[PDB]
Amino acid sequence: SAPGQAAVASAYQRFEPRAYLRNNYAPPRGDLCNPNGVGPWKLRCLAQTFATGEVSGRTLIDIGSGPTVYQLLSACSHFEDITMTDFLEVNRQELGRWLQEEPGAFNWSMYSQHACLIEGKGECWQDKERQLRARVKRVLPIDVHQPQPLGAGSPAPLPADALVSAFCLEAVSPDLASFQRALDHITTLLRPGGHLLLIGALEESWYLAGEARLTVVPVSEEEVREALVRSGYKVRDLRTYIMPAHLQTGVDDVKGVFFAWAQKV
């Protein structure tokens, strides 16, 4: 078990946040004007799920935030305490730049505007970002391969009412078995009856983050569903987006994207 993990940790030492941001969150993949694009689909899954009112509580943990905040734009009106996490210091620093409203931070304002647009409440994007910054109460190291991903007696309020995780588990797991165990490990962080929102890449074997070319376990929708069931979830929603050819740039070999809403039993 330890070998595959050592390979993952080593490969991530070359991960370049800015290149990763450019590849995935600037145009063309970061084009929010095309409703058929992947950015709008992700934001829609999240906004629609939170719009049900069924996913709420006091505390939320984002698992493997990397250098991004988009996955929390709709969530942040429903949780007063948000923990963001990442394995890499360089990503935690990138989140820090953004938290401090630095220029030189990545500009999420197009995503914030798009979230305001689809949430349909007339909120301005500046109020949305102010609220996300207020509700993020800590940014913590994490390793999903450890039985306690946050370490012993972490700062984070546990158990959490909800988890969010985008493009983390399949990107740090050498094989399906590692992915299943990682899912079990983060599932310990979640209250029974709590909710997990999982976004990830389907049938991907690599992606680029600068010099770093990371190896990814290719997973199918069926594999994700079965993993959720095995970890003790009821699957409420599991959607697939098929990556259009024009978005099939050379930054990865992804075939689609999945969104799962699961409730822990």
Next chain:
Amino acid sequence: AYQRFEPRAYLRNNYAPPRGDLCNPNGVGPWKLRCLAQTFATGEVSGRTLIDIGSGPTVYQLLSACSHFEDITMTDFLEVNRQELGRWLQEEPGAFNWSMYSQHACLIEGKGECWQDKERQLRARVKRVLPIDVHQPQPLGAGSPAPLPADALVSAFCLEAVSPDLASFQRALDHITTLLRPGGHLLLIGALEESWYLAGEARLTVVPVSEEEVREALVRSGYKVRDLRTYIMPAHLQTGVDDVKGVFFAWAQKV
């Protein structure tokens, strides 16, 4: 007097904060955008061609209009305003940033449209920017490139701001009304009970008008008033740039 009008001062006074803060939905900017959006959302204001009367250096007043009219003419009395418009239309250097207004129009309209697509459509549909003088019986002169008669007019904060008194305001309205097809629509926005405003070195005289006065003026020009509403200016938006008391929005139909 208008010869000392400074577009950048005017923009700063009226379209930068506090008056240009769009975050609070009780502000004047959001109220104006809502009047315009709700009106066009009815479907009753439609056609091929539209003229914006006295555009000055602003485009917000056409953000909801532009998806209902394929040919748009913008107008102003002053070359310096016409150049400021040109800088924004051609995406030139130092153009005013209207993106907050574009974004808010998209939010209000509720169609999920992105603000870059809205600006793109506005820029595509504005075919020309022309001189205009509403004091002339033919405000656009004879044989102007503008298709006439227009199917719709929009005019925000022009007639009361260029008229010394109610009689002049009425005549200016009669004048622009000749540009409008019978059965066509006028969307008129303006200041209530204002007597002056500043634009840098220019101090401009305004005729103070009431809601009743505007209604009466419309009827006299031959319009049926479909809608007329008032925004009362809150104290935190009462700055030193004018003495405005309120803003009116009128939707009128020529008959």
